[PDB]
Amino acid sequence: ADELVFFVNGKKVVEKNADPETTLLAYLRRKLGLRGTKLGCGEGGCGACTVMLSKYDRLQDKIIHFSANACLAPICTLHHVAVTTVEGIGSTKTRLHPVQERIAKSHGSQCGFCTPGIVMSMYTLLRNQPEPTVEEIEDAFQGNLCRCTGYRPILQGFRTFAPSLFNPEEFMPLDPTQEPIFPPELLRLKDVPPKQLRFEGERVTWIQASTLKELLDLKAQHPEAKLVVGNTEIGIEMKFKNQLFPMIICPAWIPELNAVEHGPEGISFGAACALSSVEKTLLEAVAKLPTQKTEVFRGVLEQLRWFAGKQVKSVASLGGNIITASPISDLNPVFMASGTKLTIVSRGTRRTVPMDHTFFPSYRKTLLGPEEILLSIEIPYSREDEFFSAFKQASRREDDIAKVTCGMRVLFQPGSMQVKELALCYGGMADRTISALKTTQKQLSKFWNEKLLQDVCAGLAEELSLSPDAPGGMIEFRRTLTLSFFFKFYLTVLKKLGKLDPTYTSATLLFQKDPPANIQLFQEVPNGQSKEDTVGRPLPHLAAAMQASGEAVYCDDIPRYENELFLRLVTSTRAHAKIKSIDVSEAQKVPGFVCFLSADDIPGSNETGLFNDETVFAKDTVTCVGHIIGAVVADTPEHAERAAHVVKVTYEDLPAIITIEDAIKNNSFYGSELKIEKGDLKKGFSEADNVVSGELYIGGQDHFYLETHCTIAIPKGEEGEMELFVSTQNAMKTQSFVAKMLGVPVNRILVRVKRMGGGFGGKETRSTLVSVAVALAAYKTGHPVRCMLDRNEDMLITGGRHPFLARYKVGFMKTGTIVALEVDHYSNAGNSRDLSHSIMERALFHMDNCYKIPNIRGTGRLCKTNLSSNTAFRGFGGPQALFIAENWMSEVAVTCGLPAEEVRWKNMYKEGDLTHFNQRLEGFSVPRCWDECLKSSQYYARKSEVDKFNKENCWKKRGLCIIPTKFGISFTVPFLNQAGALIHVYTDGSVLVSHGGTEMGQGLHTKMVQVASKALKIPISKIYISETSTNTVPNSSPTAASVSTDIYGQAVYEACQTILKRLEPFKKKNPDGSWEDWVMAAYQDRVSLSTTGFYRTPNLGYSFETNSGNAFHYFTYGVACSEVEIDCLTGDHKNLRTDIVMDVGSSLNPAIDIGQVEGAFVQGLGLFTLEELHYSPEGSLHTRGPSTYKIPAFGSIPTEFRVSLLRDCPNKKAIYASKAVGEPPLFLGASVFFAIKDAIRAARAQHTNNNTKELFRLDSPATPEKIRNACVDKFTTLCKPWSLRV
Amino acid sequence: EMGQGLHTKMVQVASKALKIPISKIYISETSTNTVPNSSPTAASVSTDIYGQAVYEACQTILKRLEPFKKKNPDGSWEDWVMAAYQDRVSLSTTGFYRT
Amino acid sequence: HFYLETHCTIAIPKGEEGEMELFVSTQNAMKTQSFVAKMLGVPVNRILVR
Amino acid sequence: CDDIPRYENELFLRLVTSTRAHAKIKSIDVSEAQKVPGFVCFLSADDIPG
């Protein structure tokens, strides 16, 4: 093998034994020790692994810079390429780069795991355009996801490159002259002609071909050899589909495969040209050539706008997309509809054919022979009388897989409306790209008119049929899209042939962004407050700079010991079955295999889980797909994964219960019914003028913390001692569960948590699934062992939010006043209890939202099913119950024919009222939040503008909704409301604070340092918090229920008071001395400078049996108004504007609190409108990665996004008058859901029927499928019994 | 610990003070983030001074557990400890001594 | 002295805020901590000696 | 201490000490040291940050 030579951050790397299977991400992290680049998914959709690549382009005679996903970039494609990672642009140890400084100071980093990738996407943009436009800045992040921030701060801080939370005037200006130079050595090497290279790995041989002749000789000798250019398809096939291609040929260096030629018929691109290059060339052509010649080009560009992100488009080749031949390719339908010419060659042969329906004969195949390669593609200029359109509709606009995608072309006889040629090609409607030939052939010679529209729609409905078992489901929606896209094409062509009814015009408009507008309002601190007292000030997260530089250490970033091994979980592939046998004979053959662990290897107990109803490793039976059966330990992660894949388990299926309906039918529940009942329901229903009954469903949610679960376990070899580094919110339970499994006392186990790259409740208990397995491996082998879950394992195994089904009945007066309410809740709990009971209790505690209901009955049942156990997720049952409440409230308004805001206001609690669980509402600020939100959002004025828009538009509608929320603060299990701290003041006066809480991005340590600095009256610079550990603060409650600031704040405060009391005698003797003087005097006088602090929330204890006692210490409140615009023909929608007013008492840190409000709101927006998990009828999760599970993207947030923290609202019940903010704002994301529902009502009034009191059901999430299907019209109708009783 | 058996003696002291077997007590290591500003282990006084500091920390634990012992006199150390935890009483304390 | 185990130290730099964790054969973790902090020019609270 | 496993990237230090009871250090030449396989660096007073 030849040496692979490339550069990383300006340093030369010579790899003498490059393995073709090694990705750049693995190489950076495991060989170069550069851990700033992260693994977030391994499938190209999160951007956490983003790096910049720079090379000398021989064809352009210039150095080019572009971004790429290190998780998919083979190092074997990087010969003579210069890589720049986050570490290469700046650091806190030298100096931060402006991109790093701004994202940190703008509050654009919370947990920090996505920060390096976003920093690199932004950095790459600036290296290409030092003064980008706002649009270029937003587009730079099509391929980057953040789960914490809600995106607003990242964009607002970066907008600077185009009281207040940050000051742009302080920012260091960008100076391009100070950027690292391209490696001089690489610039010299450019003067040496390319030579063919060969790399040999453990399983694969890679040939880098330098010339076209070499490529053709290689393909003639090895027809099976797999070509790889960008690796964005092959990398997925290798990693996720268990494919192994022993020989790969990379033809990327070949001039002919990279040539661009402008011919008389069109523009030709070599097959290796990156999509970003195609995009640039076509944009240039569209700007220079007449509109009539660029119809096809604009179609290609419209698809490229929504094709992955910058990282993928910069490496993905044209040839790769065409030859991969995926049924959902967004480009093949366009190339097929336009008859794009393909030049195909093999040694000694060359032919050119226009792409047509025959080019794709069957699933993933094309008409190329085994020895042939695609050389170039010529995209045609459009002719006179020829028009083209391309459309794509997915689950999320940005970086998503098409549900239906198409290319449509029509050629008319000269100057007429008479069809000469017509081509309608679709992706997503079959196992290959297809053309609706039967349908289009019938229109040849017909004229473009209403009858043609009807005939084509009827034809498409018949020809593009979908059987009920079609892969991907969404049968009705997909068929509706095929007709809807044709309708858009039809109207667009009429416009181009030309007037369209003005109310129809917007149906022809391509998606357009409106400029962003963001405002944050909060309260300034008192005039006389000391500059060193930072409580109330917008201090950035203390680790934000290190997060932006890639220096912040997350679990897997901790270096491995030389003898450290890797663990891979072996999980069930059946929902419910007996395990008959396990065969490890094949796994034992994989190189580096160490051992297979199972239940029999456990030295202590195999009984685990919060309620002791789970196994550590399955014994005799598996009860869900993903149920952990055992684990393989090996010398490398790849070897452990390969060995685990071949462990063969033989099963015998048992009857399974998957759904809530299955559980109810089978009486499959955990425990008995939970219930809260107040008043007289029968009397209430008798009094009611109206009564509405219904059923509602809300789907689950995957946490999608950017850092998945991970544990490192270090066995000491003495007395059973073990030290573990874990990404968990619950070190205490990690510690006791590990000790229980090992059969040793809890005092032998040390758990340390530095920080988590997100938790969101998902790491409150389920992190032990991994911790305990890794601990067993360390115990059995005597070696350190680690495991970080891949995203697909994480989504499958670890549980998520509980789906809820509700059956309700509400009685109300004609005025809208509620007089009775019954709601029966059912949650899908999965295969163990875990936190399901407490979650249902919190759901019952919030079924009132902010409304007084005199007679009310709510019940709850936990469904026991053969699915992974669901758990805590930000909101913990509250969002589900609050959603159900707002759904019936929205129906009361509709039924009464009254404005929704009036009906909500008149039902709202008042100061001093009692809730349905009889707790008094003291300091009830919803009314102020409501009136202020109505005013600042200009709700009334906009309501009329929305109505006007709906009158003027037939196929687009707007919706507006304002909703309130209240969230009870405290753990509903009394004993968890306790908190400890430990503080030491060293002899130099520096202070080390330790407390029971953990940092997961919410800024808890930052707030505790702010609190300690105010209490001690010393600068925050003298205080430090390093980590959370069980040997500093024991028996800690999980960092949850949004109360960490409240309780650890008090514990830290109390520890500081003790320190002050001890120092007082020294301060009195030397009043003019310094803190350092007093500390040293205390030390010399032998006064201890170490103390604990503790806090117990008072007066808590509610009983469901007596419906009495305080469930919560106080409530956090807020109101949100959101406006949306839906596309009635596709299901897509824009979040136009959202205004939030939140009561967080006297904020300890308005930057962090506004960040929590925005982040929580966006996660709620995701829950209610974008995020959906799909499972087979047998209980197997289909959606296991960002490609199929769509969380909010940069482009998903409200365009105008305003957040205000309520002024003059101190909360006497918590530290420094503040209020909990973690979870309360999430439900406000439902304001988007109800604005969408309002818009759908307008669309139904327009095309469905005139029943203005109709109550149509809309379950959550309101995805494009649900939105489109609810917009009933002539198209949904197109996509019988012998007798009917009269 | 440098071989002189200081941790052994401290476990013996803590066991006598708490009136529980030494098997329930453990000392893993010495660290600056658990006990700060320590004098060097020297002058032959470690047993004397850390013995007192350990003794005092044990007294504080006993005082916190006393209400639970009085409520359930026939219970076990484990019962009292869990009752204290469930009642949100801290089971962590410092101890200190000055000759 | 002829202690059978001679002097020994392992120093682990964390890469964050000057933090360092040291495993040391010493009777004086306090002075080890402050002397390391003094040489590095960082506050004593950044140094952990075990 | 030395029984604690080494990290995969853990390096080793060897002190360079005076061979004279009392003298001026005129110069230090590490050119031969730099040739030893595995050499990473020579550290001296000017490398101290604090």
Ligand SMILES: Cc1cc2nc3c(=O)[nH]c(=O)nc-3n(C[C@H](O)[C@H](O)[C@H](O)COP(=O)(O)OP(=O)(O)OC[C@H]3O[C@@H](n4cnc5c(N)ncnc54)[C@H](O)[C@@H]3O)c2cc1C
């Ligand atoms: C996060 C993500 C998002 C994506 N988004 C989209 C999307 O929105 N729409 C869409 O359609 N696709 C999408 N893709 C798919 C993928 O990026 C494209 O199919 C890409 O264009 C393939 O190019 P490549 O160079 O990376 O292919 P590779 O993976 O390198 O090769 C792909 C296949 O093409 C063959 N091949 C390559 N070049 C030639 C040639 N010259 N002659 C003959 N055979 C050849 C290879 O042998 C292999 O079978 C996405 C992928 C990821 C990872």
Ligand SMILES: Nc1nc2c(c(=O)[nH]1)N[C@H]1C(S)=C(S)[C@@H](COP(=O)(O)O)O[C@H]1N2
């Ligand atoms: N950035 C970030 N913010 C977050 C989370 C997170 O994992 N990352 N977890 C949320 C959840 S589920 C909770 S309960 C609270 C917990 O922290 P707190 O009690 O300090 O507010 O933070 C919320 N905000």
Ligand SMILES: O=C(O)c1ccccc1O
């Ligand atoms: O929110 C709660 O009420 C709660 C109760 C018990 C455990 C975890 C929790 O979040």
Ligand code: MOS
């Ligand atoms: O209470 Mo959060 O960890 S769901």
Ligand code: MOS
């Ligand atoms: O006092 Mo002993 O350490 S000489």
Ligand code: FES
């Ligand atoms: S880890 Fe590479 S895109 Fe997510």
Ligand code: FES
């Ligand atoms: S700050 Fe972006 S994922 Fe946490």
Ligand SMILES: [Ca+2]
């Ligand atoms: Ca559960």
